[PDB]
Design a protein around this ligand. Structure first.
Ligand SMILES: CC(C)(COP(=O)(O)OP(=O)(O)OC[C@H]1O[C@@H](n2cnc3c(N)ncnc32)[C@H](O)[C@@H]1OP(=O)(O)O)[C@@H](O)C(=O)NCCC(=O)NCCS
Ligand SMILES: CCCCCCCCCCCCCCCC(=O)OC[C@@H](O)COP(=O)(O)O
Length: 651
């Protein structure tokens, strides 16, 4: 029950015949319904006529005086900001781009899958007179080309995209402006001379207020950048404040929010090893686009009402105040605007979770997951083909989408040829069957790990309970397992979203222990559970244990570096000589999983220690210098902090 948006023969057009086939596409572009009338107009004028904006202008001028006829200057400046900000969509441009993208996608992709039922909802959300808001998860640059192209090819008007100021350059800007992309500043700060450019912020508020008030569609990537790790990073609540404020003020009745999940079998950009490790370009871009990449699946979550969601928050009698340190450390070592911050901050996480949990699991995702953790030593095809069937069922049985179908053999054989850089395909003695080992080198592994992290979010919970199960043992008391698991969540907090922000970890772990008894891995003898001593269950427990190896090893070997920490140092200088150590631990062959040396997990560990408050952040001259906290001034605390993390990791 799917749809391939790129698959366009004459059957997708009205006119038919030899000629009508030969020019199939050009007709399909002609038949699309996009006119100038259904786009917001008089935007600059309406934003410059705003009573908030003119008052914001009125006071910024007032400061500059010894009558006050300098208003001309600030007003003339205020205009120029909107002149570089606002977008101006041209149906002519959109069609002609859509045509090109329909050629190019059909060149360097195999297909782009859409579940009709998910879009038939969006076409019901469209035909109610409300402004929609599309919140995808940033992974590759192609994300912002797809989201629009998918809608354009179902007779839906292109959304106005919130774009980084980087792209604002001559020619390339005036193209983007005509394709809906409106440019916004980074940090919204002219200079540290001024506190806040009240004018710019008021104009930015006004623009979005106006663009929503005219019932147009908005596209915001809540992840400031695309993910280097290959999993959803920390959500930014920058613009969601601007969009919620619009509702808070009562200038528009309601907004619909649509989480989107775009999964790639192979991202055009490829591995991020170049960053994670720490003429000739244009040649590289030719070398880039001449390669083929795999399948794509874009998954739209159910549109929900922000108005109702914001009411639903006011039904909660008490909010979550517990600190990451106050959760963990006491178990290891014997308001007015702050509520408003948390309120909008949680929404962003709730969205990214919903989006990330829509993303379809790919073939590469499943192959990498097996190759890294299930085997590593490397296996002959037949065993991997039989496993690829077994894993596929494990994913479907947990209610997740697959971005592949057909013969397991062929779906794996396709997926190998994408991982051809990491994977080595050889011939074994007295066999017609071919052998498959992955790379365990410094640079190659990161590519396998990156694509492997695609599946991590399906098993992330069961893995925490699987690690905690091993932890508690060194006839389990259920309370202790939940209590122990609950911290391993607070510890791996920064690494990624584990569950919905609206419920506590205790409950999530209780439910996931509740799942293990339903599967029948744990059974009843306060409650006393026993682990099923069955080959299949044990190998699954050890797979789930192994799966979190890199994510614990890095956090362990991070604390091994803290053991000897000399004086206060700037963080950007520290992170490099912490990241050096983890590379040096592969270089010497001390670190087990070479995955751990990735730059992403280093930032997570330091932010985790900064959340725990081992390093007291005392930022100066616009950089974070790390002060070794009074609690962790002695050695015996850091010793226990090291001993603790070691309990979860298998030796
Ligand atoms: C413009 C943008 C950069 C703003 O984020 P930022 O400036 O980096 O983040 P800050 O926390 O410094 O934002 C400052 C303001 O945001 C608002 N804000 C940020 N987090 C907030 C939260 N949790 N609750 C309420 N308001 C919040 C406040 O009004 C805050 O005011 P302040 O300056 O007095 O603190 C925005 O782009 C963003 O972060 N999110 C969208 C990402 C994006 O579209 N990037 C382009 C690539 S497609
Ligand atoms: C049918 C035709 C479809 C029309 C397609 C038009 C698409 C318009 C694109 C608008 C401009 C892009 C949107 C903003 C995205 C953006 O700003 O990406 C850059 C950052 O996130 C990532 O930065 P980094 O990872 O640090 O390089």
């Amino acid at each position: 029950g799917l749809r391939n948006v790129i698959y366009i023969n004459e059957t997708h057009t009205r006119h038919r015949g030899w000629l009508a086939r030969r020019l199939s596409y050009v007709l399909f572009i002609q038949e699309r319904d996009v006119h100038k009338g259904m786009f917001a107009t008089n935007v600059t004028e309406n934003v410059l006529n705003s009573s908030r904006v003119q008052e914001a202008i009125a006071e910024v001028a007032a400061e500059l005086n010894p009558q006050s006829k300098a208003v001309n200057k600030v007003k003339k400046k205020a205009k120029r900001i909107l002149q570089e900000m606002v977008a101006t969509v041209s149906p002519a441009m959109i069609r002609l781009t859509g045509w090109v993208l329909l050629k190019l996608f059909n060149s360097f992709f195999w297909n782009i899958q859409i579940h009709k039922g998910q879009l038939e909802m969006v076409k019901a959300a469209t035909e109610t007179n409300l402004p929609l808001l599309f919140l995808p998860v940033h992974r590759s640059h192609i994300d912002y080309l797809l989201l629009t192209f998918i809608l354009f090819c179902h007779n839906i008007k292109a959304p106005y995209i919130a774009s980084g100021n980087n792209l604002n350059i001559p020619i390339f800007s005036t193209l983007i402006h005509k394709l809906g992309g409106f440019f916004i500043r980074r940090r919204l700060d002219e200079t540290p001379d001024g506190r806040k450019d009240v004018l710019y912020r008021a104009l930015l508020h006004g623009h979005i207020v106006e663009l929503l008030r005219q019932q147009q569609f908005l596209e915001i990537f809540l992840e400031g950048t695309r993910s280097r790790s290959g999993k959803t990073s920390c959500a930014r609540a920058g613009l969601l404040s601007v969009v919620v404020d619009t509702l808070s003020t009562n200038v528009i009745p309601d907004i619909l929010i649509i989480p989107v999940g775009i999964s790639y079998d192979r991202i055009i950009e490829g591995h991020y090893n170049g960053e994670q490790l720490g003429w000739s370009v244009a040649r590289g871009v030719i070398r880039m686009l001449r390669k083929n990449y795999g399948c794509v699946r874009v998954d739209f979550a159910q549109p929900f009402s922000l108005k109702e969601y914001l009411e639903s928050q006011s039904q909660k009698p008490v909010s979550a105040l517990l600190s990451l340190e106050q959760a963990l450390l006491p178990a290891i070592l014997p308001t007015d605007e702050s509520l408003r911050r948390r309120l909008i901050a949680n929404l962003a996480e709730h969205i990214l979770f919903t989006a990330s949990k829509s993303c379809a699991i790919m073939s590469t995702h499943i192959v990498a997951c097996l190759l890294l953790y299930r085997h590593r030593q490397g296996i002959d095809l037949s065993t991997l083909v039989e496993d690829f069937f077994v894993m596929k069922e494990e994913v479907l049985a947990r209610d997740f989408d697959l971005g592949f179908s057909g013969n397991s053999e062929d779906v794996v054989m396709h997926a190998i040829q994408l991982l051809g850089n990491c994977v080595t395909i050889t011939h074994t003695s007295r066999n017609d069957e071919f052998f498959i080992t992955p790379s365990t080198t410094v640079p190659s592994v990161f590519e396998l790990n990156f694509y492997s992290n695609g599946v991590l979010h399906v098993f992330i919970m069961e893995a925490i309970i699987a690690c905690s199960l091993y932890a508690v043992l060194n006839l389990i008391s259920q309370e202790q397992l939940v209590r122990k698991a609950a911290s391993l969540c607070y510890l791996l907090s920064n690494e990624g979203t584990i569950s919905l922000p609206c419920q506590t970890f205790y409950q999530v772990c209780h439910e996931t222990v509740g799942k293990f008894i339903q599967y029948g891995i744990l059974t009843v003898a306060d409650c006393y559970l026993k682990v099923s001593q069955s080959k299949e269950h044990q190998q699954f427990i050890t797979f789930l244990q192994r799966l979190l190896g890199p994510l614990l090893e890095a956090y362990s070997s991070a604390a091994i570096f803290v053991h000897n920490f000399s004086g206060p140092v700037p963080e950007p200088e520290y992170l490099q000589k912490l990241h050096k150590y983890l590379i040096t631990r592969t270089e010497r062959n001390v670190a087990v999983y070479a995955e751990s040396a990735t730059y992403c997990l280093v930032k997570n560990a330091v932010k985790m220690f900064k959340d725990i408050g081992v390093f007291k952040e005392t930022k100066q001259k616009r950089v974070s210098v790390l002060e070794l906290s009074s609690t962790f001034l002695p050695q015996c605390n850091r010793q226990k902090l090291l001993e603790y993390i070691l309990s979860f990791v298998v030796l």
